[PDB]
Subunit: 450 residues, 4 copies
């Protein structure tokens, strides 16, 4: 009754996208009511005909929302009544807004996750395929954002792809629990008409049916874990965005975003602002905010239904839209960015091979400590000689350790450096090739699970 | 190094519980080094022997931590050197603190999750078996905390068991990803000595090995999702606590917690403070806090390793200890509480049967709207006569709808009320029985897993 | 430019409520540009005239947003040019979207906080008025949701008013830092035309001007602060909602919400669902979520301007609208609810006076512990006799302690019970009256801010 | 009586730091009980003398905790009864753990905030002093982490100091509400003995007394807003840390941390890892987590006292210790870091002066739009000629606009560039000098206030 309460309760402004799933839920329910003998066959066919008409109206974008419609459910109900009359009312028999709305949200989320999966797998495939093509590129691997050791650019790309693949796996786990029918739980204690929930499951294409009515009505686990999945995915995208923003600075100069995913001024044509990456990074907080809100909404609520649960819709809709846009923007950025092999290569310095120099002695039998001490001495000798370690003479090296032989010159090669990492998961070309094949197979498995 | 800086790096105060998994990881690495020819059989034997001694020291609780030890890892390395000499130093060949620590954490969590799983399944089993025993008990079902319709007490217990079974399922998913060997990732680019990672996997009993060195070293997905699993589980426990706290008020009077999980005064002997439930509820905030911290810690960090990741340990340890204690208290609470079948039944009122009266008409073929209106008129008529609806005469009912027959008297029975819900998942006895069977089967599956 | 990125960069969809403040900001800047010699007097006249017309177009609701407008700033800029031509373009001289946007958001928030303040103060005033008028009502005070000791219903109402008054004080602190002018900070290094920022401050009515251009452009402390204030305020309202929902249950039976703030069913006319309170309680999570998002957005960002900052608008707009609605609903609920003085009074029991019986002995000299033991004995004695302690005879009491005299009968009076609490802040009537006077004095000052 | 419960209820492992404020609270209450006649003037003597003893024991490190002490309160009480016997029991008269604990926590927080204030103001002071010393240093100002325009290094340092002064201002606001006496609220309905709360206030040195007993017992606003203050402060430090980490990369090369606040290897002696900054950044999440936990703990709790509130202690202690250490480390970092004026200056490029080139026309009366267009055309002409804008000949410039005169040469000077920003708050030297003055005044006033 209160005008402000009334405004707070209205959701027609944001839930119209539930139009089709809402109709589908009603068609399925109508068929079950008919089996239960609540509707005659002629009544069922009139209702289905009407519902199908409404579906088409939304599909064609001709549906007319009216001022009285406070939500999508009321709008669809008004339209069906207009089309078929009083018979429409029988559809509420044994059904509650409590199980009808949660059914709508799950069907909607199932469909959204299917779309998110497509965009996520496309992002992963884009990283994997670019890694395959640019597998010969080498640049600095960073630790504490300080140059540490040479790595293949592809090992970097794949590190992001692997993390995203775990997000895809979580997406599949979340979808599995979402794909469980809640309809037929009634208001709280179950459907009172011995409704055939297996028929509802089959009609709505859910994988199984809810185990307990009170739980099905009041739980929002599916909302929470979708938000947890989305937040972790965003954390990964924020790390990738941070990496690309830094690598795109003029200071690092490793890559340049395309005009399509950056902003700039005619005054400074070469200055490309990574708008795309900053947008992506920022959405991690926007999504995390939604996760935080729902956990707080649910914390400490008693059984069974409480109006507090209505906050679920806006959080889900926002995150679905955000991920859909963000994943596609990320695919665009990765597929269209331009790397500078020249600058990546020039960043490789002899100082980054001192560890390899110690490793060289290790493979000759020199103990860890002594191998490192000797390498350190080579570094110091080079310094006092005013040169770099790759330029010390063999005689220079032997003055530090007789274990240094002429083959030590092979240490001072950046390809030889990355090729030491043949153990699985490493940056050697063979290891990177293996990861690309492993990821291609994971994507295939996940693609079919979806 | 700055003294304040040094205090901030020190983790020895809380990471000593990684002592055993740290030794285990080193034994497996030493064996791999021998296979790679970095260690001789003799060196390997001497290293393993010293590691066995350190393990025994921690076990006997005699390990001596020294003021110079910054962390559990340094303590063990120092002790190994003290025990066997500088050959101990060869153990670090090709291994970084970066892949060594993440290995220890995953080993620790795998073990901790096995423990949490046992306690979680015991809580669910407790709920399910009590639901079976008290299946005949009926009480009010609440909607917006207002009495709505009769339901079986067992339907309520099982609503919680079902939610907890989903938490168990997520626990299994999280465990599978934690059960992946990260050791042999080196500092960032992988292990430089072509170390046998399959051998490491086998010795440490991981199910598979990490796919990428940079990811394996820098990701803390496993911590995040463990914290997400833990938070959602705590949300469920906070809800059950809220329910039980309200049902235990003297106003509701449905149940009383045992003395072991409540507190009170000799001045008001019949009053019991739901101590245990309030503690359980508050832990939702505590665990959520850890989830929030690690997500913020990870946000915006660049590749590959950054010192920020050290915040993981304290968050993991706190949540592991919190869930372990909370799950056991919850089981104790559910197991030992006493219900008042008397008060639960006395709370059932005729007014809570008006919906059933409309449903009676629906079954006779009266359209939804008309049935609702007819029941409403019955409720209003009874109000005008100063009686309850179960007291209206058949004649009074017929004046409202000729569809009311003599069998309408069956509507005013609370057992008949709950027995309407035979559709799967409902509160009818047969449906509750099916739920118990399904949950017993589920627990069996999850325990085998 | 990628179409999806274009849409994501588009703010026009939600930033239109900044229309008027955007214009006010431009009017002030134009005036300063003329003083700086960038605009002539006639140009200034035409520009101010055009700006006023755009302002009227927005207020009349006839403003035409075009597909090319990516944000409100672009919209007003395009419109001004359509109205007055080429000279419109001189208005942006030395200005950046960076200082234009923070100026707009701060002006919007200043106005919004004045509105929120009005509603917050009305809520407190509504609670205080109710506490004054229902000052004789006594009901149980709760400890762990268990009946503890009698308290005045007014003390309960005032506990909520006191907390909300602290929220009002924080509101004032946030408003002061928001009331600082950022305009004239340029894109990063400051305004390049020696613009008169004091004139800008005076025209826009800000209290002072920002100290550093880089900070002014990149900080969103004012957003975070507002969000922390809003979140703590919602926590307070979530607690009040929890209380009223519990008290409104038929089990407690203390109060009933009006039809305007609850939902009902003709099938159960006595049952009222407190959906207004459930709504309020749920908004705490919604508001908290905005606070968590902005904190995460800002965490780890480098200097100076970053596109990430654009997430501020939607979070502020949502919390502003949420607070404005919830506060008014809360006021209505408190103002229109109906208490049952009968049920609140019936809820007071003799058992709740056992602590008073002990205090009675304490005032006569018996030490803490001994008085406690004595009372416990009286409770137990009453139990063995199957009676309430107020029914015990004086000899029954003397057998326990000789300090029990005939006047111990005064202990068994609920009004006498609450009247023991005369120490400042207690539930005695004199203390409650003092509280009412203190809160009114506080509000007077706060409104005078 | 459950064992796990007892373990969860224990806090002796972490609340001993409340030993002294606990004793001060008991001394204050003892005195009031006397004035109220609960204690004889000689019972007050035995009690006080005994408390002052326990005070000495704790301050000597000789206090002995027993396996029976579950918390600091019980420890101090057990000990009081060991020193003076049974009489110590009268101290509980009319007082509750509910009001005793909040009192201890507020007294503890008041003292901790004075310490935090000292470290915070010292950090601000170090930034401002450094800004005054290095006022002549110029480097790039960044927009989207891309070089935008010249700015003074001091403008960057002061931007951080200004944000920190707002944190200092919030600290003071939080302290004021913490400086309110809760003792004498009893368990819920207030103190039942007409205790003199003004005396309690005066003894404990609180500024005023709590207004309502139920609120004073159950509110934890002071904890929440201390945590909000701490979190925003950490956000500021997380930003300064991010900046310094990036500027310390070899790629940027603008500064180097001292050995005391970084870590390094003998193998790469020139590589310094910014451990201190990474540690500082990581604590934003740790502190935010405490804020998040307490907000969730409080949400939905009914009046009045609930055990849930006990989570306050650990959250406050953690954040107090975290802030105390972090602020001191930041002060050390800023104070001892080494800048490379050469590299900061070398980072300034002519392309960063295109905006200045347009402003040059603006000051000659050319409208904003045409000035920007002309500059854009100058930039393009230079680009096609393969030269920088400062190398375009005056003839080239005039081909773009006759308004370009020989004095346009003054535009291509980075000092002239920063000196344009004389409007208050800008980067011109006079403006930076004014900021330093204002911040000195602000620090003086905040220190004076508290």
């Amino acid at each position: 009754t209160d005008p402000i309460m009334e405004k707070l309760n209205s959701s027609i402004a944001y839930d119209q996208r539930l139009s089709e799933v809402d109709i589908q839920g009603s068609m399925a329910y109508a068929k079950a009511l008919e089996k239960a003998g609540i509707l005659t066959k002629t009544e069922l066919e009139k209702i289905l005909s009407g519902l199908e008409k409404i579906s088409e109206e939304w599909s064609k974008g001709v549906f007319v929302v009216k001022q009285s419609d406070e939500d999508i459910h009321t709008a669809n109900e008004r339209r069906l009544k207009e089309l078929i009359g009083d018979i429409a009312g029988k559809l509420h028999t044994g059904r509650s807004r409590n199980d009808q709305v949660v059914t709508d949200l799950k069907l909607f989320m199932k469909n959204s996750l299917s779309i998110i999966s497509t965009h996520l797998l496309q992002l992963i495939k884009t990283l994997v395929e670019r890694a395959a093509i640019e597998i010969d590129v080498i640049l600095p691997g960073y630790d504490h954002l300080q140059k540490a050791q040479p790595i293949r650019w592809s090992q970097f790309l794949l590190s992001h792809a692997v993390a995203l693949t775990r997000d895809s796996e979580r997406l599949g786990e979340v979808k599995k629990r979402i794909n469980v029918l809640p309809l037929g739980s009634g208001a709280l204690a179950g459907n009172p008409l011995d409704i055939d929930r297996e028929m509802l499951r089959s009609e709505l294409e859910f994988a199984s049916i809810s185990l307990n009515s009170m739980d099905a009505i009041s739980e929002r686990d599916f909302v929470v874990e979708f938000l947890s999945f989305a937040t972790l995915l965003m954390i990964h995208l924020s790390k990738m965005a941070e990496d690309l923003i830094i690598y795109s600075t003029s200071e690092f100069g490793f890559l340049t975003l395309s005009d399509a995913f950056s902003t700039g001024s005619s005054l400074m044509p070469q200055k490309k602002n990574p708008d795309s990456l900053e947008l992506i990074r920022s959405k991690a907080g926007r999504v995390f905010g939604r996760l935080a809100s729902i956990l707080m909404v649910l914390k400490g609520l008693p059984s069974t239904y409480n109006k507090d649960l209505q906050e679920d819709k806006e959080a889900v809709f926002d995150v679905v839209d955000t991920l859909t846009a963000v994943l596609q923007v990320a695919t665009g950025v990765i597929s269209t960015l331009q790397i500078s092999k020249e600058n990546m290569e020039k960043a490789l310095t002899p100082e980054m091979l001192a560890t390899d120099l110690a490793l060289y002695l290790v493979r000759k039998g020199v103990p860890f400590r002594q191998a490192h001490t000797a390498s350190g001495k080579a570094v110091h000798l080079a310094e006092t000689k005013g040169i770099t370690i790759n330029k010390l003479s063999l005689e220079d090296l032997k003055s530090i350790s007789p274990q240094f032989s002429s083959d030590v010159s092979q240490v001072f090669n950046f390809v030889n450096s990355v090729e030491q990492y043949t153990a699985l998961a490493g940056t050697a070309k063979s290891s990177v090739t293996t990861q690309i094949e492993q990821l291609r197979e994971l994507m295939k498995k996940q693609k079919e699970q979806a």
